[PDB]
Design a protein around this ligand. Structure first.
Ligand code: H09
Length: 238
């Protein structure tokens, strides 16, 4: 059968998002050589991550209810924020370092290698440390990542279709609140924590904007490339 997004319980939402999670990818460099472009390695990894991101987005409840056109718009707006939140998530347990891959752990000083890269590393590190200080949970993380996908390009857009995106966002909010209530936080505590997490999302937006400026100054997937990737997914084996 098929669940409609708006009928999911909190536990079914959590379960669907956990099940949709992409794998952790490794960097493609020979462990026999030192002698590699940092830019090259990060570009190669991001590219492989994007393929998995397409498969993931298709599994975010509500996403496939939208038109192909609207799906591509959302991904085009959100793809860097999504790569960034995943990065800061897995870097939480590594104070002062970014875990790009289990075989690609980088500090501040290594970031200085590429020009304009150091401001962005620092902002990512601050996000990772804020998430560690808040003890961000995996269940919360998957909800935040889905919120990024559905909200990033909603205002830069068929009005009844917008209510649907807004109703799916309300469902994800409900799911976050339910996780926090089960964790034993009080009402005010539930609200304060929700606020804190949503406010971090504006910082993630900021980082993505700065990231995009930096990428465009030199790689960036266009509406057309994302459309092509979303469409090609239909030809993948089950
Ligand atoms: C994302 C990106 C890039 O993306 C190119 C897009 N690929 C094209 C799509 C069609 F194939 C090209 C070089 C990079 F160094 C990075 C990196 C980068 N790589 C990652 C890999 C996994 C997880 C997170 C990241 C980040 C965040 C972050 C530090 N990124 C730096 C910046 F923010 F993009 C610079 O402004």
């Amino acid at each position: 059968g098929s669940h409609m997004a708006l009928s999911l319980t909190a536990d079914q939402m959590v379960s669907a998002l956990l099940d949709a999670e992409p794998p952790i990818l490794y960097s493609e460099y020979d462990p026999t050589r030192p002698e590699a472009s940092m830019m090259g390695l990060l570009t190669n990894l991001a590219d492989r991550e994007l393929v998995h991101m397409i498969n993931w987005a298709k599994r975010v409840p509500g996403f496939v209810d939208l038109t192909l056109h609207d799906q591509v718009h959302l991904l085009e707006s959100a793809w860097l924020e999504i790569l960034m939140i995943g990065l800061v998530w897995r870097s939480m347990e590594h104070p002062g370092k970014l875990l790009f891959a289990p075989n690609l752990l980088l500090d501040r000083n290594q970031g200085k290698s590429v020009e304009g890269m150091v401001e962005i590393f620092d902002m990512l590190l601050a996000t990772s440390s804020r998430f560690r200080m808040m003890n961000l949970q995996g269940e919360e993380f998957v909800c935040l990542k889905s919120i990024i996908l559905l909200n990033s390009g909603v205002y830069t857009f068929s009005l009844e279709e917008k209510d649907h995106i807004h109703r799916v966002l309300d469902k994800i909010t409900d799911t976050l609140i339910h996780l926090m209530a089960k964790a034993g936080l009080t009402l005010q505590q539930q609200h304060q924590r929700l606020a804190q997490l949503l406010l971090i999302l504006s910082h993630i937006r900021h980082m993505s904007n700065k990231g995009m400026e930096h990428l465009y100054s030199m790689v960036v997937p266009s509406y057309d490339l994302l459309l092509e990737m979303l469409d090609a997914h239909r030809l993948h084996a089950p």
